[PDB]
């Protein structure tokens, strides 16, 4: 029974390693299907969010410093607040295009 | 050293000891299946690669092809031939014959893995744990077939490795990677990686459905709310207090 | 003979594809809202974000 307890502890450690290999890549594969499905559906073949995702590609390729990019991040928060055909939104889109 | 003709395949990579259906859209391959049915009912199932040519070259195939046995061959009335296949072993390609069919010369892989009760048994049990948790979020195949094709009825880890690699929806190359390697333990590690990635897709899709359900409930709740009581305001006026 | 509601049942066949076009319009509306349902626990509907 001590050999059975050692075998059950080794099986529990091996199954815990299997569940760690599940969860530690599951928490990033959540992120990659989140980004490819926001890139897909909001155009629905149009890919409307690739227009506002090329700018985010410019953020995580050349919008590197954090107090610089914090203003662009809450400008990105303001970007989905109003419709991008309003006359105020010209200044908002020109703002982060000129910044990026 | 198995001198038998070859049925080439387009998107199915038939692994050894795999019960599956194959449809043939060719004529030279149709005559290859008929000549193999005349000669001792044995086929070779060697798939092709990235974008497929309808007449496959002998050097456009992969490294390892699959030895097969013919169950039956009935003719569909539209012209194509449905070939029901059962496979036996796997064979490394050396050089094939470019005369209308394809001829397999031709090898064999007689390589069982080592360290069976110590390290391979834990690996086979991890394959069993991942394959047991696989259909609980997949739910497109039969659970009793998964239990009947387990270690409890099928002892061979090469047959079990080919059956655990067959039961996913992978591409033309990642089935061929588990077809190719003579070391069975590295194939078992790779199909653990592939079943981990498939379960990280399927539990994610279950969280997609279980993520959208409560905000669709919130959506019909708020939809009934604003069509209810923007509309309760019109009875306070009673003719809208002289047409607003 | 025909103008005395012969084409009214064909107008109901037209209204059948109006109800089918209603079904893919509700499908597109449901799809656009369920991607926002993925976005609400992506994080856009939390306290810190927008």
């Amino acid at each position: 029974l001590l050999r059975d307890l050692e075998r059950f502890e080794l099986d529990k450690k091996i199954a815990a390693r299997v569940k760690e290999q599940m969860d530690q890549n599951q928490r990033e594969y959540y992120l990659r299907e989140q980004m490819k499905a926001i890139q897909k559906e909001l155009g629905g073949g149009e890919d409307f969010l690739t227009e506002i995702e090329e700018l985010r590609e410019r953020i995580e390729k050349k919008g590197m410093p954090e107090p610089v990019k914090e203003k662009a991040l809450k400008e990105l928060k303001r970007l989905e607040r109003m419709q991008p055909g309003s006359p105020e939104a010209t200044v908002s889109r020109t703002y982060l295009d000129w910044l990026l | 050293r198995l001198e038998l003709p070859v049925l080439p395949l387009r998107n199915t990579v038939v692994l050894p000891h795999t019960t599956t259906g194959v449809d043939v859209g060719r004529l030279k391959s149709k005559r290859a299946v008929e000549e193999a049915l005349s000669a001792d009912r044995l086929l070779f199932l060697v798939t092709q690669k990235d974008p497929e040519v309808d007449d496959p070259a002998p050097e456009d195939l992969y490294a390892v092809g699959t030895l097969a046995v013919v169950k039956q061959a009935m003719r569909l009335p539209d012209g194509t031939l449905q070939v029901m296949v059962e496979a036996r072993s796997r064979a490394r390609l050396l050089s094939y014959v470019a005369a209308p069919y394809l001829r397999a010369v031709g090898e064999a892989i007689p390589e069982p893995p080592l360290k069976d009760p110590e390290l391979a048994r834990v690996l086979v049990n991890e394959v069993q744990e991942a394959f047991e948790r696989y259909l609980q979020n997949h739910k497109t195949l039969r659970l009793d077939r998964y239990q009947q094709e387990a270690v409890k009825s099928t002892r061979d880890p090469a047959i079990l490795a080919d059956l655990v690699a067959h039961h996913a929806t992978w591409t033309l190359e990642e089935k061929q990677t588990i077809l190719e390697t003579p070391e069975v333990e590295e194939r078992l590690k790779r199909v653990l990686a592939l079943l981990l990635r498939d379960l990280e897709r399927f539990e994610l899709d279950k969280k997609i459905a279980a993520r959208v359900k409560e905000q669709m409930d919130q959506n019909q709740r708020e939809y009934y709310l604003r069509e209810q009581m923007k509309a309760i305001q019109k009875e306070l006026g009673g003719g809208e207090d002289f047409l607003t």
Side-chain angles (χ1 to χ4, degrees), chain A residues 1-53 55-100, chain B:
Chain A
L1 278 181
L2 282 176
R3 198 261 313 271
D4 287 335
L5 288 175
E6 288 179 353
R7 187 181 176 181
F8 267 119
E9 283 181 352
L10 286 174
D11 285 330
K12 277 182 180 180
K13 284 179 181 178
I14 282 161
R17 286 180 182 178
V18 169
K19 291 175 185 177
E20 276 178 353
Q21 289 175 356
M22 184 65 73
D23 297 332
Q24 286 177 357
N25 295 316
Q26 188 183 176
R27 288 187 179 180
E28 192 275 331
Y29 291 166
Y30 285 166
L31 287 177
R32 59 88 173 173
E33 272 201 358
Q34 266 167 336
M35 61 80 71
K36 68 182 290 294
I38 63 170
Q39 279 174 357
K40 187 251 182 182
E41 195 278 331
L42 207 66
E46 172 57 44
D47 295 343
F48 169 69
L49 186 149
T50 61
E51 161 198 0
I52 65 172
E53 172 57 25
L55 61 84
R56 281 194 299 271
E57 172 49 11
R58 223 166 182 185
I59 296 169
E60 288 84 4
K61 286 288 177 61
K62 63 167 287 190
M64 197 161 322
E66 308 294 323
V68 182
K69 84 195 292 181
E70 191 147 319
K71 186 71 191 296
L73 273 171
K74 65 92 175 179
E75 190 58 44
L76 174 71
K77 293 174 182 66
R78 210 195 298 179
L79 183 147
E80 288 171 349
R81 176 63 66 181
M82 71 215 88
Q83 190 258 328
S86 71
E88 192 186 42
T90 297
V91 177
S92 79
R93 292 192 72 84
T94 315
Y95 181 71
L96 76 165
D97 283 330
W98 201 297
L99 188 152
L100 277 169
Chain B
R1 271 85 182 272
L2 308 167
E3 288 87 5
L4 285 153
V6 170
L7 173 59
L9 317 175
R10 35 180 68 92
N11 280 315
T12 59
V13 187
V14 173
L15 295 173
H17 284 84
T18 294
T19 304
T20 175
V22 163
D23 200 4
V24 181
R26 302 184 65 209
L27 293 176
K28 305 171 186 176
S29 290
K30 166 187 175 179
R31 290 190 297 272
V33 174
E34 290 169 355
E35 283 180 351
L37 183 61
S38 67
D40 191 74
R41 293 182 181 178
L42 293 177
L43 278 166
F44 269 98
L45 301 181
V46 194
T47 189
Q48 56 184 343
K49 59 182 66 174
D50 291 332
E52 314 151 357
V53 177
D54 49 351
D55 198 5
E59 296 296 320
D60 271 336
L61 309 173
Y62 279 116
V64 163
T66 306
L67 173 70
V69 64
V70 189
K71 285 187 175 182
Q72 61 182 353
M74 81 305 288
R75 295 178 183 176
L76 295 178
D78 51 349
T80 182
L81 265 74
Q82 179 185 0
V83 185
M84 187 66 204
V85 287
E86 180 187 359
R88 187 173 183 177
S89 177
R90 50 194 186 272
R92 181 83 69 86
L93 281 73
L94 189 66
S95 181
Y96 278 18
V97 180
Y101 61 95
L102 289 172
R103 184 178 287 268
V105 291
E107 276 289 324
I109 312 297
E111 189 158 348
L114 294 175
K115 294 180 181 179
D116 285 332
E118 289 183 353
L119 283 180
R121 188 190 66 85
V122 178
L123 195 62
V124 160
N125 279 319
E126 284 166 350
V127 162
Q128 276 293 315
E129 284 285 330
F131 199 55
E132 194 70 33
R133 262 77 173 177
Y134 180 65
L135 188 151
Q136 295 169 353
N137 301 112
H138 193 187
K139 279 185 281 291
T140 73
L141 294 177
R142 186 164 179 262
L143 186 60
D144 211 7
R145 284 179 185 268
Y146 273 28
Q147 288 189 356
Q148 279 171 356
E149 291 176 351
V151 176
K152 202 173 182 179
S153 296
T154 307
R155 201 262 313 157
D156 201 3
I159 296 173
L160 168 78
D162 287 326
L163 279 175
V164 67
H166 177 71
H167 287 110
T169 56
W170 286 120
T171 66
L172 188 51
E173 192 180 5
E174 284 190 352
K175 305 267 194 174
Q176 182 58 248
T177 53
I178 300 169
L179 179 53
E180 183 182 1
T181 304
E183 174 188 359
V184 183
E185 275 188 346
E186 210 272 335
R187 307 186 308 122
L188 288 170
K189 290 176 182 179
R190 282 184 310 179
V191 70
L192 290 174
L194 289 186
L195 285 195
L196 274 167
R197 184 155 74 192
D198 288 330
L199 267 177
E200 285 145 1
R201 294 175 189 182
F202 289 145
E203 296 186 357
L204 155 62
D205 297 329
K206 261 74 178 174
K207 275 203 68 66
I208 285 304
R211 183 176 292 171
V212 297
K213 52 166 179 162
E214 71 279 12
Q215 155 64 70
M216 294 298 102
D217 297 333
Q218 184 54 256
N219 183 32
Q220 55 93 31
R221 180 82 269 167
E222 73 192 2
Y223 164 101
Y224 182 86
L225 271 182
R226 82 291 184 276
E227 271 153 336
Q228 168 191 4
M229 51 97 78
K230 297 185 291 294
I232 73 168
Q233 272 85 17
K234 64 92 176 179
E235 199 181 3
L236 180 66
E240 294 293 328
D241 287 325
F242 273 130
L243 184 63
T244 57

